[PDB]
Design a protein around this ligand. Structure first.
Ligand SMILES: CNc1nc2c(N)ncnc2n1[C@@H]1O[C@H](COCC(N)=O)[C@@H](O)[C@H]1O
Lengths: 111, 377
């Protein structure tokens, strides 16, 4: 039953999908630097500092992911907008798997 | 060029009277109000939206609510009370609070008005970015209940920020000015100003004769506002999730946040339509939460809080020695006054009497400040 109006919603969802990709890239960059940092030529106080810099950066990643979530949470999708509904659902769950990732890094660095 | 500035507790606002009309000025983000927030960084100082946006990454170097401290002594009942709810450091420098933080890693502290001068530097900059001109002259407003030291520490914030503060005008006076209540002609007029925002509630009764203002009394509730309505919705929806799903979301901070945000936005929708729908996919344990709320349900949740905004009103009439019959004008300010039920409780307390509300209740104070500053310049 593909309508003009669902197209608006699908385009919103795709711009949100790309935002997500930017943040996920930020998370990938975080993880890569982290693995590098636990390569201790640095003194332990300093490695610690650097790990807290990383922790503040995961916090911002969590935060940006949460702001996306709040935005998607503004959508009202009719039952028959099956296509957007499905894209909205996959995007929410993708973010939450990314959030779980950030919790893993964050729970584990700068306690 | 002369601006009016509403230096609000949570939000600030700057207008300029130009071309026969006040223009409320949007910031670099397009927001017609700006968060009264400053954050302290490894590299930079952030003010306004930038600062509010990162009150998670850096909550120890992010300061708000410095209007609750400005001009007050460290042992002021108020500086003690609010202090417990502030992740930032409040230290005692010789009986008067300085805010302590880390900034480019060197440790730094500020009295409340250096911090409020920062907010006013933003508000000045916001105006200069819009006008493409230097802005030095300003009226700054304060609450009517501000003492001498609170007014003067405010004035000084403006001066440090590089403002020629033409006048410190009371918030409910500036909102009366907004509605040109002072250009009316006849006998002495009693004005009730009803100001309910996100976090505070202030009632003020002024008399105005011959364009001259006098504050008669002041009341309110320091911690009643729109946030309290958001809570009532949140508990209502948390109980609903428990009923349908046998899950308790309330220990999941990110669910609770998703719900709260959707609650506050649903509340806004309910000020101009009689029902609000919410869909949150995957709210808790992967469970979608789709729901709606009527306006009457919203009101019912809030029935005691709304009615109760009337107690400060009666307290205010009493202290001014007026009967509700002797009030000529009622002025609404603060974004929460948008709620049709509050308008109706109040407009039926004053036996069918109407209300000055046509001006955006978040912008009315800056509006009157701007009209004032143009007269004074
Ligand atoms: C524009 N606000 C705003 N618009 C409202 C509206 N249309 N209906 C009910 N409350 C409204 N608020 C409330 O004002 C308080 C202060 O808002 C300041 C802010 N910028 O959030 C908040 O409690 C907010 O829920």
């Amino acid at each position: 039953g593909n309508s003009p109006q669902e197209e608006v919603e699908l385009k919103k969802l795709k711009h949100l999908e790309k935002s997500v990709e930017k943040i996920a890239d930020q998370l990938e960059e975080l993880n890569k630097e982290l693995t590098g940092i636990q390569q201790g030529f640095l003194p332990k106080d300093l490695q610690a500092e650097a790990l807290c810099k990383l922790d503040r950066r995961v916090k911002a990643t969590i935060e940006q992911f949460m702001k996306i979530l709040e935005e998607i949470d503004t959508l009202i999708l009719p039952e028959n907008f099956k296509d957007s509904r499905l894209k909205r659902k996959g995007l929410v769950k993708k973010v939450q798997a990314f959030l779980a990732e950030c919790d893993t890094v964050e729970q584990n660095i700068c306690q | 060029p002369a601006v009016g500035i509403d230096l609000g507790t949570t939000y600030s606002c700057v207008g300029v009277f130009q071309h026969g009309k006040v223009e409320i000025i949007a910031n670099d983000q397009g927001n017609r109000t700006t968060p009264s927030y400053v954050a302290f960084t490894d590299t930079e100082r952030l003010i306004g939206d930038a600062a509010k946006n990162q009150v998670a990454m850096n909550p120890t170097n992010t300061v708000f609510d410095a209007k609750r401290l400005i001009g007050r002594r460290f042992d002021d009942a108020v500086v003690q009370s609010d202090m417990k709810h502030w992740p930032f450091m409040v230290v005692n420098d010789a009986g008067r609070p300085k805010v302590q933080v880390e900034y480019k890693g060197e440790t730094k502290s500020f009295y409340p008005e250096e911090v409020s001068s920062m907010v006013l530097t933003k508000m000045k900059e916001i105006a200069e970015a819009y006008l493409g001109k230097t802005v030095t002259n300003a009226v700054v407003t304060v609450p009517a209940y501000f003492n001498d030291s609170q007014r003067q520490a405010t004035k000084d914030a403006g001066t440090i920020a590089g403002l020629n503060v033409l006048r410190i005008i009371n918030e409910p006076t500036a909102a009366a000015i907004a509605y040109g209540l002072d250009k009316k002609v006849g006998a002495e007029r009693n004005v009730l100003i009803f100001d309910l925002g996100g976090g505070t509630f202030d009632v003020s009764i002024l008399t105005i004769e011959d364009g001259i203002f006098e504050v008669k009394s002041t009341a309110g509730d320091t911690h009643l506002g729109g946030e309290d309505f958001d809570n009532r919705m949140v508990n209502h929806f948390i109980a609903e999730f428990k009923r349908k799903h046998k899950k308790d979301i309330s220990e999941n901070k990110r669910a609770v946040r998703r719900l709260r945000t959707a609650c506050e936005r649903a509340k806004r929708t309910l000020s101009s339509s009689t029902q609000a729908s919410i869909e949150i996919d995957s709210l808790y344990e992967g469970i979608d939460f789709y729901t709606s709320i009527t306006r009457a349900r919203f009101e019912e949740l809030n029935a005691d809080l709304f009615r109760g905004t009337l107690d400060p009103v009666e307290k205010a009439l009493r202290d001014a020695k007026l009967d509700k019959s002797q009030i000529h004008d009622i002025v609404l300010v603060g974004g929460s006054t948008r709620i049709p039920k509050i308008q109706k409780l109040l407009q039926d307390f004053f036996n069918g009497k109407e209300l000055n509300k046509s001006i955006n209740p978040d912008e009315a104070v800056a509006y009157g400040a701007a009209v004032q500053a143009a007269i004074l310049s």
